[PDB]
Design a binder for this molecule. Sequence first.
Ligand code: YCH
Length: 261
Amino acid sequence: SAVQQKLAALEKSSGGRLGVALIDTADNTQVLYRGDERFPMCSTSKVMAAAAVLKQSETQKQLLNQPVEIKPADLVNYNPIAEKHVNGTMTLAELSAAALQYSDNTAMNKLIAQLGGPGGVTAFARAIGDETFRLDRTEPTLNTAIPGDPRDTTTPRAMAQTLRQLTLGHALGETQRAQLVTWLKGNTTGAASIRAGLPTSWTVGDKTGSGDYGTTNDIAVIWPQGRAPLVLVTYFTQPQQNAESRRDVLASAARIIAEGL
Ligand SMILES: *[B@@]1([O])O[C][C]([C][O])O1
């Protein structure tokens, strides 16, 4: 199609490897570019950790209010929110919001611990039918994004389907689903990524990711005014270990997708 030719041209212009999956929930149509190739998830994995904890809270009704101590030893490389509560506590709700809306790495590690390790996050993915997602490491090493390394990867197709199920489907309870959507809509890190390629009138909930090899990711649910919502995943990685982020590539991919509607 035209869209796939334009995405291929964008990729060629960028010097990297681009993965895109769009699900149009109107007719359940899909648009895929390298849809079944593995990409490093980096912080887009935080959606799965938060959702797994939300799933736990369906049975443990008070779980999200559980206080969790933030100790200096817990701090890793990027802890914008956890830093504000060292030697204090954050609830699991506050940690989930920090992981999602600020991409706090300490928060992510506390969510992983709550789930019994990376295998507990992966287990949740399997439980909702995602056979592709794999979380192998904690923060910060899950962002190494080494070419060919299958650790901490998924495919665009798999992530799109899973994000659809978590936000628009019923993989989560009604209150949990609404909470996740609210959190994603309140993301603070996404202004230059998918959001920047879309009409300003559309409502977006997204989770960005960045890592080594210039890995620049964004996964989003999109609510166009007067139109069925869309799920869009954009993954991008580069051949140089110290490559710079390229959020403009994700904005451009979103713009190309939006034009084709
Ligand atoms: B994710 O990718 O978003 C930011 C942090 C930086 O380590 O991880």
